[PDB]
Amino acid sequence: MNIFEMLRIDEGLRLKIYKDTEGYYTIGIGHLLTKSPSLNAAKSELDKAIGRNTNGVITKDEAEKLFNQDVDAAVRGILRNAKLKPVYDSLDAVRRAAAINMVFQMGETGVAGFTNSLRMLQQKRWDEAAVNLAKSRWYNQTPNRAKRVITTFRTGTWDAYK
Ligand SMILES: Clc1ccccc1Cl
Numbered sequence: 661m662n663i664f665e666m667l668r669i670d671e672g673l674r675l676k677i678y679k680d681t682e683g684y685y686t687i688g689i690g691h692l693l694t695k696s697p698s699l700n701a702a703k704s705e706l707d708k709a710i711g712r713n714t715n716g717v718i719t720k721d722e723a724e725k726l727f728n729q730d731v732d733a734a735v736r737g738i739l740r741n742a743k744l745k746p747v748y749d750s751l752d753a754v755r756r757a758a759a760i761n762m763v764f765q766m767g768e769t770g771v772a773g774f775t776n777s778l779r780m781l782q783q784k785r786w787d788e789a790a791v792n793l794a795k796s797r798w799y800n801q802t803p804n805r806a807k808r809v810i811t812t813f814r815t816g817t818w819d820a821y822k
Contacts (some may be wrong), residue, residue, distance in 0.1 A: 663761070664731065672766075690765075691730055744763075752816055758817040773796070777792045777793045
């Protein structure tokens with residue numbers, strides 16, 4: 661297991677434009693296209709991302725190419741964020757993947773509400789952190805995924821993903 665395999669389980673793989681859990685147009689492995697309700701706007705973002713006229717459909721290779729870029733940018737964003745970097749750097753590699761997972765799903769702005777959880781994580785108060793993490797819109801709206809990510813933070817193992 662690693663961050664790619666982890667997100668591939670949590671995000672799935674779909675080669676046609678679909679709506680994510682929040683109703684936003686998305687493709688591939690959780691590649692958010694736009695928060696606009698316009699499918700035409702989404703199709704434009706897709707074409708822009710792939711570099712060709714896709715007509716709303718992409719290949720597995722293209723999906724994986726976007727996925728690699730998205731993971732890379734998520735991690736790099738963490739390192740560039742003064743509130744996230746110290747916590748991330750304090751973590752072991754397994755819990756780091758859990759951190760990347762969260763940012764991938766909710767973005768840095770979504771993670772901004774988690775200040776108290778991040779402090780507990782930096783403190784390595786794992787059980788307390790896990791309890792705090794579940795007190796969130798995130799957990800309530802995607803409990804099965806949140807439980808997997810939280811278990812990963814709690815234990816520093818890949819138990820929740822087999
Ligand atoms: Cl970047 C991030 C997201 C969620 C928990 C910890 C960290 Cl460092």
